[PDB]
Design a protein around this nucleic acid. Structure first.
Lengths: 127, 185, 111, 167, 183
RNA sequence: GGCGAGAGACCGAUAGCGAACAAGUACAGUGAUGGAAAGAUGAAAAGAACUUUGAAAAGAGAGUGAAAAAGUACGUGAAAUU
RNA sequence: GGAUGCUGGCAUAAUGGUUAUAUGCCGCCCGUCUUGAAACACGGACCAAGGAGUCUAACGUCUAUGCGAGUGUUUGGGUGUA
RNA sequence: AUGAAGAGCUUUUAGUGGGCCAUUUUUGGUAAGCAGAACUGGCGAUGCGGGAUGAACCGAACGUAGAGUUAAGGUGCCGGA
RNA sequence: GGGUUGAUAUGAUGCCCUGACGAGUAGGCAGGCGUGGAGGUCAGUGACGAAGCCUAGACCGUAAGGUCGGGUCGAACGGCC
RNA sequence: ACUUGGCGGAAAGGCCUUGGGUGCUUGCUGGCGAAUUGCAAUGUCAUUUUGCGUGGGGAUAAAUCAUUUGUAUACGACUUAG
């Protein structure tokens, strides 16, 4: 249902982890730059972690896209969805996380009727 | 690698697209850059830059200055152009009939010109009358008339106006400023 | 540097393969006598071969043609340099200096 | 709302692709292949088998047969990069091979619903192979041991080195 | 309520608890792991033998610098001990659980002990008086204990999934050719 | 400062007055002086009748409650550590 | 002045990703002052929460805005939905 | 002659104001991985390949990947050849 | 450095073309992510479960970080200028 | 697969031989069959252990604790006895 996109290359699927995020619990994985003076990570020694930089950035034609080829866009209601009405082949819907189950059911039926894709069509379903 | 003979990724050092968020000025800039791009006219390009200019690189222009310019030869029936503001000057008592185009007009200057029988004009009206700068005359005002340019470049044997709040006796008129108290500069 | 007296074949190859014009401070590949006559038509030059003719039968407009030519960005030679260690003279068993007419071999490799 | 909007939505109008300049020219086979020539199948069900080569079809394939009366190979179409061509040469002037073609080698593809639990052949193809194979054996009877050269299979042994071998 | 992790049929099971007990966490842990997975009567008998010092508890984890004893041979060790107090609290719990089990109406000889865990409780803290005018802590490290006993059931089950298979035409043809060529 | 009133682009229980609670309190020091910590069950105690094991505490059941994954070691209940 | 055509199989965890482990090669502990730190130089047992170029008076350059030889309403007064 | 990658001009403000190494010139000193100067290049502020190992040496200066060719160093094996 | 207001359609700070370049401590500038509260808007989510917490489960972004699913819980909270 | 008789002790565990049976023989000439795995997809053929079965034989113990000893000994261990 999507649009012709090129082949998607990401250039780093592995997550950039803060140095010693593994060693000390007080150091969390949220990436954070070693500004030190004798830091082999800042110095880019061999066998150390790769620091982020703008060459790892993605191709503009594939950027923000999901594997489907759609860009995600968050909806809380049929109105936000009707905004996406005419861009189904490029944009897909994410029902928010704070939504109630009955409103989710409504949104899902409406999206089916309008030919719109939904990437979380199982939130708060029993069976 | 490269043995660079320059500095890399350096900016031009020249303002494009001012950081005035005035939408009307931005409209003028859209207009005059279209005109600069197509009308092959140095006047259009000049005006575009002078629109990018800052407040102090956009000084005022006195109607008496305009009058000197029109007292030039071959320049009487011309159309004066000022990217900035036009100020009144009651140090004069006559004034000619010409038309003047500019961004801003002090109410006194506008009155003076209208009374002399001219018309005060905007740059868009100018762009419809004289796109390529037909029969125009650009004026810029003084820049080194400024009470910071007094202090710019302050050193010995330059005569360059120290930075000082209070004036008079016993405020920097002593040692350094006469041969009795040691030395004169 | 390694410098030498070049031949017509290597001039011609260097240009036809690595031929680049400094056109208002950009590096444009040549690909056309139209480009060449647009820029260097002033100097009686129309074709890449007329350019080469000036170059090798050094002319009164060699200055302008050579300056129009972006510097040739050569690769490292294919079969090597012929010597294990480079930074001696060509004479002492190295690479640099005036290798007056083996430069054609080197350049044809690097091209 | 949860997310505001994008200002400009990109269009859906798919751009038509450009007029490519790739023509399709027929295949230039290697000079080691001429019809009536013995091949060695390297791959497939019939891997490692001496077989005959008759025709060069239009989908860059080669028409081939055992013959079936000899080694169990039927009429088939194979690939020149997946066969070795021998030096041995058998005459084939006298076969009506111009009938065969890609439509004759048609599969009638299988659907999706046809999922097999665990697990026919055309009289036309049978009698065709019979015609052709009787002609081929009749020509084979001239040179000696050839029937058996085909009936057997091909293999590499300890000490067999292809770049030093010839076929 | 709200015991630890169990993979067990709660219908064929009984349970027992003890909370905020002034007994050493380490020794109770070792006692527990000594009777873990055991048959219940066997366990009670073993602990009585321990208290008679005819058998022993192995100290697997908290065993540093303690002495050895030949009884560890039974378990593959050298280090073992006889924690009377832990043992007493534990077999009191087992009494509790056997009672609850028979009140549920269980076999009472197919029984075994399928969960037993011990974990640290709030420290009970006194003050010790040390040289040069100093105070230090004298903290009991108490314990919570919970155990769960169970009927042994017959063999669990059989009949795993169908193990669906997806083949190439080539593998199917190989299969069929072999089923042709042979019987 | 005292008494009485109203307000806030202020702090929100390691913050804000030292003190949101029996805080100038407990407590220390000869004394002058010093000077804490500590809020929240639940809408409502309906705060767990009764049975059973145990010397008892408690446990297992039962039951209340919308919820005991709310049981006065009570809102949620992170991490270290287990 | 940038690759198209033909054919086959699969259409699912097969590719791929995440993750653990194994294997090969590399990989000294961070922060710090230091010419020089893996240091036999200092701080760091661990976790959470708090935690450090702010506010003001008067100024310089610069940039925006308003007016423009003038500019500044807001000491004060008038008035008010205060 | 060659090149010019734009030429000129101003304002303002940070950090710095402990320095060290190599080639060559060189002063004191028996000499020093010592002390003190000169030109240039470097380390500091800089990873990469090589030197087993090393702040400075040789080679080469770094966005993310791929393919090819080399530098210096090497090709018994560890270790690619 | 350039091109492009032209009418219908969207974004002129937009779109597009071409060429070159990308080391970095101290330090400077810029563009952004995030937190508490304020004015506005979404006639925003919400006891049919807000926030918070857990999650070698998924998705986006170079990244800061953001979103989603499952679990827990119980009363408020977010997007944008 | 049986069967006769030898040899081999460095880690023999293999080498050789006799008798007869049975099967194949591409030494030679022949006949029948293969197809459809669709133009390739390792296209699956080996040995390593373990377990549950069926059926055929075969055999029906010791050690540790505890106890005791003292030629031993920090406890363990060791030595002895029952």
């Amino acid at each position: 249902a999507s649009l012709p996109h090129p082949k998607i290359v990401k250039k780093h699927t592995k997550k950039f982890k803060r140095h010693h995020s593994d060693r000390y619990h007080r150091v969390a994985e949220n990436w954070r730059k070693q500004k030190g003076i004798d830091s082999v990570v800042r110095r880019r020694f061999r066998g150390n972690i790769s620091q982020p930089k703008i060459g790892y950035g993605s191709n503009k034609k594939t950027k923000f896209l999901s594997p489907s080829g759609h860009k995600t866009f968050l909806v809380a209601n049929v109105k936000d969805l009707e905004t996406l009405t005419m861009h189904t082949k490029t944009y897909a819907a994410e029902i928010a996380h704070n939504i109630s189950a009955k409103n989710r059911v409504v949104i899902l039926a409406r999206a089916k009727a309008l030919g719109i894709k939904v990437t979380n069509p199982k939130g708060r379903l029993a069976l | 690698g490269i043995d660079h003979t320059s500095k890399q990724h350096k900016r031009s050092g020249h303002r494009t697209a001012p950081k005035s968020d005035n939408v009307y000025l931005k409209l003028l800039v859209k207009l005059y850059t279209f005109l600069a791009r197509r009308t092959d006219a140095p006047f259009n390009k000049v005006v575009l830059k002078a629109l990018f200019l800052s407040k102090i690189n956009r000084p005022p222009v006195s109607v008496s200055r305009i009058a000197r310019a029109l007292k030039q030869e071959g320049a009487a029936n011309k159309t004066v152009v000022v990217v900035g503001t036009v100020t009144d000057d009651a140090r004069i008592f006559e004034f000619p009939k010409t038309t003047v185009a500019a961004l801003r007009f002090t109410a006194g200057a506008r009155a003076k010109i209208v009374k002399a029988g001219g018309e005060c004009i905007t740059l868009d009206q100018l762009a419809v009358r004289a796109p390529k700068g037909q029969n125009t005359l650009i004026l810029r005002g003084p820049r080194n008339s400024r009470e910071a340019v007094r202090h710019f470049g302050m050193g010995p044997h330059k005569g360059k106006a120290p930075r000082i709040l209070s004036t008079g006796r016993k405020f920097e008129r002593a040692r350094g400023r006469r041969r009795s108290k040691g030395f004169k500069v | 540097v390694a410098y030498g007296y070049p031949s017509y074949s290597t001039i011609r190859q260097l240009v036809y393969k690595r031929g680049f014009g400094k056109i208002n401070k950009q590096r444009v590949p040549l690909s056309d006598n139209a480009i060449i006559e647009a820029n260097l038509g002033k100097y009686g030059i129309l074709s890449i071969d007329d350019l080469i003719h000036e170059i090798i039968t050094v002319g009164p407009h060699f200055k302008q043609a050579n300056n129009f030519l972006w510097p040739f960005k050569l690769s490292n030679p294919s079969g090597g340099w012929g010597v294990p260690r480079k930074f001696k003279h060509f004479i002492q068993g190295g690479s640099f200096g005036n290798r007056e007419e083996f430069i054609n071999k080197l350049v044809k490799s690097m091209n | 709302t949860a997310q505001q909007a994008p200002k400009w939505y990109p269009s859906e109008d798919v751009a038509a692709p450009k007029k490519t300049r790739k023509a399709v020219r027929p295949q230039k086979l290697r000079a080691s292949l001429v019809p009536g020539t013995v091949l060695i199948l390297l791959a497939g069900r019939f891997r490692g088998k001496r077989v005959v080569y008759l025709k060069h079809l239009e989908d860059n394939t080669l028409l081939v047969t055992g013959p079936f009366k000899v080694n169990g190979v039927p009429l088939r179409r194979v690939n020149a990069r997946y066969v070795i061509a021998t030096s041995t040469k058998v005459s084939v002037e006298g076969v009506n091979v111009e009938k065969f073609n890609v439509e004759y080698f048609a599969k009638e593809k299988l659907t999706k619903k046809e999922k097999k639990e665990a697990n026919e052949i055309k009289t036309e193809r049978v009698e065709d192979q019979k015609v052709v194979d009787k002609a081929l054996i009749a020509e084979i009877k001239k040179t000696p041991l050839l029937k058996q050269y085909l009936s057997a299979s091909f293999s590499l042994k300890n000490g067999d080195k292809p770049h030093m071998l010839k076929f | 309520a709200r015991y630890g992790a169990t993979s067990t049929n709660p219908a064929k099971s009984a349970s027992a608890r003890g909370s905020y007990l002034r007994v050493s966490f380490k020794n109770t842990r070792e006692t527990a792991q000594a009777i873990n997975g055991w048959e219940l009567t066997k366990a009670q008998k073993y602990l009585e033998q321990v208290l008679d010092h005819q058998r022993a508890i192995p100290f697997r984890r908290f065993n540093s610098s303690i002495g050895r004893t030949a009884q560890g041979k039974e378990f593959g060790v050298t280090k073992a001990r006889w924690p009377a107090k832990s043992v007493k609290f534990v077999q009191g719990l087992l009494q509790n659980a056997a009672a609850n089990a028979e009140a549920k109406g269980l076999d009472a000889t197919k029984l075994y002990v399928s969960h037993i865990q011990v974990n640290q409780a709030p420290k009970q803290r006194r003050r010790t008086y040390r040289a040069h005018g100093r105070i230090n802590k004298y903290e009991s490290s108490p314990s919570h204990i919970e155990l769960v006993v169970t009927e042994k059931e017959e063999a669990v089950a059989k009949a795993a999934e169908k193990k669906v298979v997806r083949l190439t035409s080539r593998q199917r043809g190989r299969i069929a050719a072999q089923k042709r060529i042979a019987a």
